Design a binder for this molecule. Sequence first.
Ligand SMILES: Nc1nc(N)c2cc(CNc3cc(Cl)ccc3Cl)cnc2n1
Length: 186
Amino acid sequence: VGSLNCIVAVSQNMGIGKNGDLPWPPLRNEFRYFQRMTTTSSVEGKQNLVIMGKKTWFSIPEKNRPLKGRINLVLSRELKEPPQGAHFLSRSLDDALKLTEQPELANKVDMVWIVGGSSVYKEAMNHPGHLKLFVTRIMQDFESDTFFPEIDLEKYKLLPEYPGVLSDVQEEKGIKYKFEVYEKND
Ligand SMILES: Nc1nc(N)c2cc(CNc3cc(Cl)ccc3Cl)cnc2n1
């Protein structure tokens, strides 16, 4: 299995959702970036895995679920099977990561990817090892009810650029944003 990653878009006030929707109006090219980064595999014969909590799964528009061309894994202790259209279910992030090494997945998975929600980001972000964060900074405040965990810059280094990530300021629908990549290894 390849690298472990989180990907998020976050407002200036650290918001990532409001009632299960994005705090901001749809940013079509930001979503394209999220689809491209998560899908683009780093090996032959494999797909990337996406790991998300249950609320994040059901926040994705049905037309958009599962995320195509990726293996979709949902985290829940309440669910007893994967939701309709999903591929795998685990009780917890540690369990999911253990699964990727079982014979059923070992072969199949390139990059791993954590796409939310807040508690899943927090546990990944505080677990030892090699982890990258792909963070889109939406450069405005937006009313939110779910937030990205604090990024400890003692351990997460902001990279000066990264292949496939634009370094400049972007703007859609009057909202400026920028892409960042952070990396820790502890
Ligand atoms: N950078 C980044 N990182 C993530 N984890 C993202 C995840 C999503 C998934 N959420 C979502 C998707 C659609 Cl099209 C509409 C409604 C919602 Cl709530 C959307 N954009 C994301 N951007």
